[PDB]
Amino acid sequence: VESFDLDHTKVKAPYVRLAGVKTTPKGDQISKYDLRFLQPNQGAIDPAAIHTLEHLLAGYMRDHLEGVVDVSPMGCRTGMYMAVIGEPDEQGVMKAFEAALKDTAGHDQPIPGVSELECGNYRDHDLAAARQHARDVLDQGLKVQETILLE
């Protein structure tokens, strides 16, 4: 329940998907979401670009969604992972993500927090590619993806 056993060949990117739910000791719920940009195993986002997307979405997701724990790039680089304090709400996360991506696509200012003081690899960034990935997702159109379990 904390991490659904997803069949990666059956999903349709881009999408938002509830990936698991963890209940805290006092009864609160931590919802985990799979924010998929690319189709699994059909290519990956460049390290620089996903790093920049991390910098931009960290802030833009919080402008549109409450209770965000963190937004992290997935090791597979086809999307972002995000934990949110609150009961599952795929529709609300989808709308927040869509709004955050519009902010990212239209981000023509310096990348926030890029320096040796605030960033662990300040030289590895790509705004242009980050913005274009946001645009591609919006062009294709997002949807809530159901979890197809493996056998």
Annotated binding site: 51, 55, 119
Taking the C-alpha atoms of residue 79 and residue 38, their distance in angstroms, rounded to an integer, is: 7
Structure tokens at 78: 């086809």
Instruction: Report helix angle 47-64 to 127-140, nearest 10.
Output: 60
What mask, x for binding Zn ion by CB under 5 A, covers residues 103 to 132?
----------------x-------------
Partner whose binding site includes residue 21, from its own copies, Zn ion, none (CB under 5 to 8 Å by kind): none
Binding-site sequence positions for Fe cation: 51, 55, 119
Residue with Cβ nearer Zn ion (18 or 114):
114
Identified binder of Zn ion from the candidate list 30, 76, 99, 129, rule CB under 5 A: 76
> Which of 25, 14, 97 shows the shortest CA–CA distance to 62?
97
Please give the residue ranges that form the binding site for its own copies (CB under 8 A): 5-9, 22, 24-28, 30, 32, 40-41, 44, 47, 50-55, 69-70, 72-79, 81, 83, 85, 116-124, 150
